[PDB]
Amino acid sequence: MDAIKKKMQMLKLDKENALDRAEQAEADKKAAEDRSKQLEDELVSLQKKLKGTEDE
Amino acid sequence: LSDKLKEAETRAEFAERSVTKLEKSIDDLEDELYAQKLKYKAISEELDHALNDMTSI
């Protein structure tokens, strides 16, 4: 009865914590992905600028 | 007839005592059941509240 109420509430809390960990992982993943896109863009920019400097 | 009337009055008084005792007994049983039934209804309403709490997830 009362124990069921509190146990379910603690479970609810465990589920929110699990979603919180998932959201933290997804935020760190989004940061890493933004870094990867910036690095790929700089990489292609560097490769063609290098090709142009080689042509010069 | 006097003897018969005295016997009749004694048995009538006995029956009156009996009805009085039964009236107290039924009043007590009714109160106990009212309390238990209120307990049951409270249990049911709290269970409904619990059910909506689990559905809220």
From Swiss-Prot, chain A:
Biased composition (Basic and acidic residues): 12-38
Chain positions found as N-acetylmethionine: 1
The organism's place on the tree of life at top rank: Eukaryota
Tissue specificity annotation: Detected in primary breast cancer tissues but undetectable in normal breast tissues in Sudanese patients. Isoform 1 is expressed in adult and fetal skeletal muscle and cardiac tissues, with higher expression levels in the cardiac tissues. Isoform 10 is expressed in adult and fetal cardiac tissues, but not in skeletal muscle.
Region (Disordered): 1-38
Subcellular localization(s) per the UniProt record: Cytoplasm, Cytoskeleton
Phosphoserine PTM positions: 45
Signal sequence interval, chain numbering: none
Effect of residue 15 to N: Impairs interaction with LMOD2 and TMOD1
Associated disease: Cardiomyopathy, familial hypertrophic, 3: A hereditary heart disorder characterized by ventricular hypertrophy, which is usually asymmetric and often involves the interventricular septum. The symptoms include dyspnea, syncope, collapse, palpitations, and chest pain. They can be readily provoked by exercise. The disorder has inter- and intrafamilial variability ranging from benign to malignant forms with high risk of cardiac failure and sudden cardiac death. Cardiomyopathy, dilated, 1Y: A disorder characterized by ventricular dilation and impaired systolic function, resulting in congestive heart failure and arrhythmia. Patients are at risk of premature death.
Subunit record text: Homodimer. Heterodimer of an alpha (TPM1, TPM3 or TPM4) and a beta (TPM2) chain. Interacts with HRG (via the HRR domain); the interaction contributes to the antiangiogenic properties of the histidine/proline-rich region (HRR) of HRG. Interacts (via N-terminus) with LMOD2 (via N-terminus) and TMOD1 (via N-terminus).
Domain comment, as recorded: The molecule is in a coiled coil structure that is formed by 2 polypeptide chains. The sequence exhibits a prominent seven-residues periodicity.
Family indicated by similarity: Belongs to the tropomyosin family.
Function comment: Binds to actin filaments in muscle and non-muscle cells. Plays a central role, in association with the troponin complex, in the calcium dependent regulation of vertebrate striated muscle contraction. Smooth muscle contraction is regulated by interaction with caldesmon. In non-muscle cells is implicated in stabilizing cytoskeleton actin filaments.
Record's protein name: Tropomyosin alpha-1 chain
Organism listed in the record: Homo sapiens (Human)
Residues of the full protein shown: 1 to 56 of 284
UniProtKB/Swiss-Prot annotation, chain B:
Main location: cytoplasm
Alphabetically ordered keywords of this record: Acetylation, Actin-binding, Cardiomyopathy, Coiled coil, Cytoplasm, Cytoskeleton, Disease variant, Muscle protein, Phosphoprotein
Effect listed in the UniProt record for changing residue 56 to A: Loss of phosphorylation and decreased formation of actin stress fibers
Post-translational modification summary for this protein: Phosphorylated at Ser-56 by DAPK1 in response to oxidative stress and this phosphorylation enhances stress fiber formation in endothelial cells.
Tree of life domain: Eukaryota
Tissues in which the UniProt entry reports expression: Detected in primary breast cancer tissues but undetectable in normal breast tissues in Sudanese patients. Isoform 1 is expressed in adult and fetal skeletal muscle and cardiac tissues, with higher expression levels in the cardiac tissues. Isoform 10 is expressed in adult and fetal cardiac tissues, but not in skeletal muscle.
Residues bearing the modification Phosphoserine: 25, 44, 56
The keyword Phosphoprotein appears for this protein: yes
GO molecular function: actin binding; actin filament binding; cytoskeletal protein binding; identical protein binding; protein heterodimerization activity; protein homodimerization activity; structural constituent of cytoskeleton; structural constituent of muscle
Signal peptide per UniProt: none
GO cellular component assignments: actin cytoskeleton; actin filament; bleb; cytoskeleton; cytosol; muscle thin filament tropomyosin; ruffle membrane; sarcomere
Phosphotyrosine modifications at: 34
Similarity comment: family membership: Belongs to the tropomyosin family.
Domain comment in the entry: The molecule is in a coiled coil structure that is formed by 2 polypeptide chains. The sequence exhibits a prominent seven-residues periodicity.
Role noted for this protein: Binds to actin filaments in muscle and non-muscle cells. Plays a central role, in association with the troponin complex, in the calcium dependent regulation of vertebrate striated muscle contraction. Smooth muscle contraction is regulated by interaction with caldesmon. In non-muscle cells is implicated in stabilizing cytoskeleton actin filaments.
Subunit and partners: Homodimer. Heterodimer of an alpha (TPM1, TPM3 or TPM4) and a beta (TPM2) chain. Interacts with HRG (via the HRR domain); the interaction contributes to the antiangiogenic properties of the histidine/proline-rich region (HRR) of HRG. Interacts (via N-terminus) with LMOD2 (via N-terminus) and TMOD1 (via N-terminus).
Protein name according to UniProt: Tropomyosin alpha-1 chain
Gene source species: Homo sapiens (Human)
Lineage: Eukaryota, Metazoa, Chordata, Craniata, Vertebrata
